Design a protein around this ligand. Structure first.
Ligand SMILES: [Cl-]
Ligand SMILES: [Cl-]
Ligand SMILES: [Cl-]
Ligand SMILES: [Cl-]
Ligand SMILES: [Cl-]
Ligand SMILES: [Cl-]
Ligand SMILES: [Cl-]
Ligand SMILES: [Cl-]
Ligand SMILES: [Cl-]
Ligand SMILES: [Cl-]
Ligand code: NA
Ligand code: NA
Length: 129
């Protein structure tokens, strides 16, 4: 599914991401925009052989099992394919564990490179929240 911007912000807010570990909702929408373009079915290969899955591009090295990523872990205890659902629940829940892992949203390189230090409130401008 390709989410609308405000649709996704509403769903993320409903799932408790606004100010989760101190990250305002626009940070999460910004990350989603540059990871997936709001598309739940997005998959992209990493240089290390792992793959990133779903609206927040969660990686198979640490977080989900895709059956093809050597010496990897599955800390969210989920098949990576379940991150591509039109229901963002599994993505959101797994992201809550990643952001709690110590480096905050720096775990998402695209957040660090494209959202951090910018006016992320812009991503929820106009949304009825
Ligand atoms: Cl929308
Ligand atoms: Cl947009
Ligand atoms: Cl929702
Ligand atoms: Cl915000
Ligand atoms: Cl498997
Ligand atoms: Cl393959
Ligand atoms: Cl694997
Ligand atoms: Cl594991
Ligand atoms: Cl949803
Ligand atoms: Cl932090
Ligand atoms: Na990416
Ligand atoms: Na894995």
């Amino acid at each position: 599914k390709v989410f609308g911007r405000c649709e996704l912000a509403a769903a993320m807010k409903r799932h408790g991401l606004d100010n989760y570990r101190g990250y305002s909702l626009g940070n999460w929408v910004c990350a989603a925009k540059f990871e997936s373009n709001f598309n739940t079915q997005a998959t992209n290969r990493n240089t290390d052989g792992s793959t990133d899955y779903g609206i927040l591009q969660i990686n198979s090295r640490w977080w989900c099992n895709d059956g093809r990523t050597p010496g990897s872990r599955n800390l969210c205890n989920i098949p990576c394919s379940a991150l591509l659902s039109s229901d963002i629940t599994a993505s959101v829940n797994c992201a809550k564990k990643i952001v709690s892992d110590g480096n905050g949203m720096n775990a998402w390189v695209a957040w660090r490179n494209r959202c951090k230090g910018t006016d992320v409130q812009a991503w929820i401008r106009g949304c009825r929240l």
